[PDB]
Amino acid sequence: ATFEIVNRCSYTVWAAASKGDAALDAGGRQLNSGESWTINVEPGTNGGKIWARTDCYFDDSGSGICKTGDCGGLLRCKRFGRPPTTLAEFSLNQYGKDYIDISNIKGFNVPMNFSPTTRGCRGVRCAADIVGQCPAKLKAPGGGCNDACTVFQTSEYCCTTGKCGPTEYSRFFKRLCPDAFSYVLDKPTTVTCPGSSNYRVTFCPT
Protein backbone atom coordinates (compact mmCIF):
# COMPACT_ATOMS: atom_id res chain seq x y z
CA ALA A 1 0.00 0.00 0.00
CA THR A 2 1.20 3.52 -0.67
CA PHE A 3 1.02 6.31 1.87
CA GLU A 4 1.84 9.78 0.58
CA ILE A 5 2.96 11.82 3.58
CA VAL A 6 2.58 15.56 2.96
CA ASN A 7 3.85 18.35 5.18
CA ARG A 8 1.58 21.40 4.74
CA CYS A 9 2.94 22.94 7.96
CA SER A 10 4.99 26.10 7.79
CA TYR A 11 7.73 24.29 9.77
CA THR A 12 9.82 21.23 8.96
CA VAL A 13 8.69 17.91 10.35
CA TRP A 14 10.41 14.55 10.40
CA ALA A 15 7.83 11.97 9.40
CA ALA A 16 7.98 8.57 11.08
CA ALA A 17 6.38 5.24 10.23
CA SER A 18 6.58 2.08 12.35
CA LYS A 19 4.62 -0.95 13.52
CA GLY A 20 6.32 -0.86 16.93
CA ASP A 21 8.86 -3.66 16.41
CA ALA A 22 10.03 -2.57 12.93
CA ALA A 23 10.20 0.37 10.55
CA LEU A 24 7.65 0.77 7.81
CA ASP A 25 9.59 1.57 4.62
CA ALA A 26 12.64 3.62 5.65
CA GLY A 27 10.95 4.45 8.96
CA GLY A 28 11.49 8.21 8.79
CA ARG A 29 12.51 11.18 6.67
CA GLN A 30 12.72 14.95 6.81
CA LEU A 31 9.81 16.84 5.22
CA ASN A 32 10.38 20.55 4.73
CA SER A 33 7.28 22.74 4.43
CA GLY A 34 5.38 21.60 1.35
CA GLU A 35 7.33 18.37 0.75
CA SER A 36 5.74 15.01 0.03
CA TRP A 37 7.26 11.60 0.75
CA THR A 38 5.60 8.42 -0.48
CA ILE A 39 6.17 5.21 1.42
CA ASN A 40 5.24 1.61 0.76
CA VAL A 41 3.67 -0.38 3.58
CA GLU A 42 3.44 -4.17 3.26
CA PRO A 43 -0.04 -5.63 2.95
CA GLY A 44 -1.25 -7.17 6.18
CA THR A 45 0.57 -4.65 8.39
CA ASN A 46 -1.21 -4.68 11.74
CA GLY A 47 -0.87 -1.83 14.20
CA GLY A 48 1.04 0.57 11.98
CA LYS A 49 1.42 4.22 12.88
CA ILE A 50 2.57 7.38 11.12
CA TRP A 51 3.40 10.56 13.02
CA ALA A 52 5.29 13.81 12.79
CA ARG A 53 8.35 14.70 14.84
CA THR A 54 9.32 18.26 15.54
CA ASP A 55 12.52 20.11 16.41
CA CYS A 56 14.89 17.35 15.41
CA TYR A 57 18.69 17.20 15.07
CA PHE A 58 20.41 14.27 13.41
CA ASP A 59 24.07 13.62 12.74
CA ASP A 60 25.41 12.15 9.48
CA SER A 61 24.70 8.61 10.74
CA GLY A 62 21.03 9.40 11.39
CA SER A 63 21.30 9.48 15.15
CA GLY A 64 20.04 12.37 17.18
CA ILE A 65 17.02 13.79 19.06
CA CYS A 66 13.57 15.30 18.48
CA LYS A 67 11.41 17.21 20.89
CA THR A 68 8.24 15.40 20.00
CA GLY A 69 7.89 11.86 18.68
CA ASP A 70 11.55 10.88 19.11
CA CYS A 71 11.96 7.14 18.37
CA GLY A 72 15.08 6.14 20.26
CA GLY A 73 17.08 8.92 18.66
CA LEU A 74 16.89 7.51 15.11
CA LEU A 75 16.05 9.41 11.93
CA ARG A 76 14.80 6.11 10.56
CA CYS A 77 12.34 4.92 13.18
CA LYS A 78 12.05 1.27 14.10
CA ARG A 79 9.93 1.85 17.22
CA PHE A 80 7.07 4.12 18.26
CA GLY A 81 7.69 7.71 19.21
CA ARG A 82 7.86 9.57 22.47
CA PRO A 83 4.65 11.44 23.37
CA PRO A 84 3.18 13.88 22.62
CA THR A 85 2.37 12.52 19.17
CA THR A 86 -0.78 12.85 17.10
CA LEU A 87 -1.12 9.35 15.59
CA ALA A 88 -2.37 8.10 12.22
CA GLU A 89 -3.10 4.44 12.98
CA PHE A 90 -3.90 1.61 10.60
CA SER A 91 -4.22 -2.12 10.18
CA LEU A 92 -4.29 -3.35 6.58
CA ASN A 93 -5.79 -6.49 5.05
CA GLN A 94 -7.51 -7.64 8.23
CA TYR A 95 -10.01 -10.24 7.01
CA GLY A 96 -10.23 -8.40 3.73
CA LYS A 97 -10.58 -4.83 5.02
CA ASP A 98 -8.39 -1.96 6.13
CA TYR A 99 -9.01 0.03 9.33
CA ILE A 100 -7.83 3.59 9.94
CA ASP A 101 -8.10 6.13 12.74
CA ILE A 102 -6.48 9.15 14.33
CA SER A 103 -5.62 8.97 18.02
CA ASN A 104 -4.82 11.55 20.71
CA ILE A 105 -4.28 8.80 23.33
CA LYS A 106 -0.54 9.58 23.21
CA GLY A 107 -1.14 13.32 23.08
CA PHE A 108 -1.01 15.79 20.23
CA ASN A 109 1.89 17.58 18.56
CA VAL A 110 0.92 18.40 14.94
CA PRO A 111 -2.53 18.56 13.30
CA MET A 112 -3.28 15.77 10.86
CA ASN A 113 -5.62 14.56 8.10
CA PHE A 114 -5.56 10.83 7.28
CA SER A 115 -7.56 10.04 4.15
CA PRO A 116 -7.79 7.31 1.53
CA THR A 117 -6.60 8.20 -1.97
CA THR A 118 -8.73 5.33 -3.36
CA ARG A 119 -12.50 4.70 -3.27
CA GLY A 120 -14.87 3.31 -0.73
CA CYS A 121 -14.43 5.14 2.58
CA ARG A 122 -13.95 8.53 4.23
CA GLY A 123 -10.95 10.17 5.84
CA VAL A 124 -10.48 11.31 9.42
CA ARG A 125 -9.03 14.58 10.67
CA CYS A 126 -7.76 16.23 13.84
CA ALA A 127 -6.83 19.74 12.76
CA ALA A 128 -7.83 21.96 15.65
CA ASP A 129 -5.29 24.02 17.60
CA ILE A 130 -4.88 21.52 20.42
CA VAL A 131 -1.42 22.80 21.36
CA GLY A 132 -2.63 26.41 21.62
CA GLN A 133 -5.70 25.42 23.65
CA CYS A 134 -3.97 22.73 25.76
CA PRO A 135 -4.87 22.65 29.47
CA ALA A 136 -2.03 24.07 31.56
CA LYS A 137 -1.32 20.78 33.34
CA LEU A 138 -1.01 18.89 30.02
CA LYS A 139 1.35 21.30 28.27
CA ALA A 140 4.65 19.52 27.54
CA PRO A 141 7.61 21.85 28.23
CA GLY A 142 9.42 20.14 25.34
CA GLY A 143 6.51 21.03 23.02
CA GLY A 144 2.96 19.74 22.35
CA CYS A 145 -0.01 18.70 24.49
CA ASN A 146 0.48 15.55 26.56
CA ASP A 147 -2.21 13.00 27.20
CA ALA A 148 -3.18 12.58 30.87
CA CYS A 149 -1.71 9.06 31.10
CA THR A 150 1.74 10.39 30.19
CA VAL A 151 1.43 13.18 32.77
CA PHE A 152 -0.20 11.43 35.76
CA GLN A 153 0.37 7.65 35.35
CA THR A 154 -2.95 6.53 36.86
CA SER A 155 -4.97 3.43 36.12
CA GLU A 156 -7.90 5.69 35.19
CA TYR A 157 -6.03 7.69 32.53
CA CYS A 158 -3.96 4.78 31.25
CA CYS A 159 -6.96 2.36 31.27
CA THR A 160 -4.69 -0.20 32.82
CA THR A 161 -7.43 -2.59 33.82
CA GLY A 162 -9.64 -2.03 30.80
CA LYS A 163 -12.51 -0.27 32.74
CA CYS A 164 -11.80 3.47 32.65
CA GLY A 165 -14.19 6.27 31.77
CA PRO A 166 -13.84 9.61 30.04
CA THR A 167 -12.11 12.31 32.07
CA GLU A 168 -11.87 16.09 32.12
CA TYR A 169 -8.64 15.71 30.15
CA SER A 170 -9.95 13.23 27.58
CA ARG A 171 -12.98 15.44 27.05
CA PHE A 172 -10.68 18.35 26.10
CA PHE A 173 -9.15 16.29 23.26
CA LYS A 174 -12.59 15.03 22.26
CA ARG A 175 -14.12 18.53 22.19
CA LEU A 176 -11.31 19.85 19.98
CA CYS A 177 -11.20 16.69 17.81
CA PRO A 178 -14.39 14.63 17.89
CA ASP A 179 -13.13 12.29 15.18
CA ALA A 180 -10.02 11.09 17.03
CA PHE A 181 -9.66 8.69 19.95
CA SER A 182 -9.39 10.66 23.20
CA TYR A 183 -8.86 7.77 25.64
CA VAL A 184 -8.45 4.01 25.36
CA LEU A 185 -12.15 3.12 25.69
CA ASP A 186 -13.51 6.01 23.65
CA LYS A 187 -16.42 5.27 21.34
CA PRO A 188 -14.49 4.20 18.24
CA THR A 189 -13.88 6.58 15.36
CA THR A 190 -12.23 3.89 13.23
CA VAL A 191 -13.10 3.89 9.54
CA THR A 192 -13.40 0.68 7.54
CA CYS A 193 -11.84 0.91 4.09
CA PRO A 194 -11.56 -1.70 1.31
CA GLY A 195 -8.63 -4.02 1.77
CA SER A 196 -5.54 -2.69 0.01
CA SER A 197 -6.62 0.93 -0.08
CA ASN A 198 -3.97 3.65 -0.47
CA TYR A 199 -3.72 6.76 1.68
CA ARG A 200 -2.43 10.27 2.26
CA VAL A 201 -1.38 11.66 5.64
CA THR A 202 -1.30 15.45 5.59
CA PHE A 203 0.29 17.43 8.43
CA CYS A 204 -1.34 20.83 9.01
CA PRO A 205 -4.18 20.20 6.55
CA THR A 206 -5.88 23.52 7.28
From Swiss-Prot:
UniProt cross-references to InterPro entries, sorted A to Z: Osmotin/thaumatin-like_sf, Thaumatin, Thaumatin_CS
Pfam families xref list: Thaumatin
Keywords: Cytoplasmic vesicle, Disulfide bond, Signal, Taste-modifying protein
Signal recorded as keyword: yes
Subcellular location: Cytoplasmic vesicle
GO cellular component: cytoplasmic vesicle
Disulfide cysteine pairs (residue numbers): C9-C204, C56-C66, C71-C77, C121-C193, C126-C177, C134-C145, C149-C158, C159-C164
Main location: cytoplasm
Domain of life where this protein originates: Eukaryota
Family matches, as PROSITE patterns: THAUMATIN_1, THAUMATIN_2
Family affiliation: Belongs to the thaumatin family.
Function, as annotated: Taste-modifying protein; intensely sweet-tasting. It is 100000 times sweeter than sucrose on a molar basis.
UniProt protein name: Thaumatin I
Gene source species: Thaumatococcus daniellii
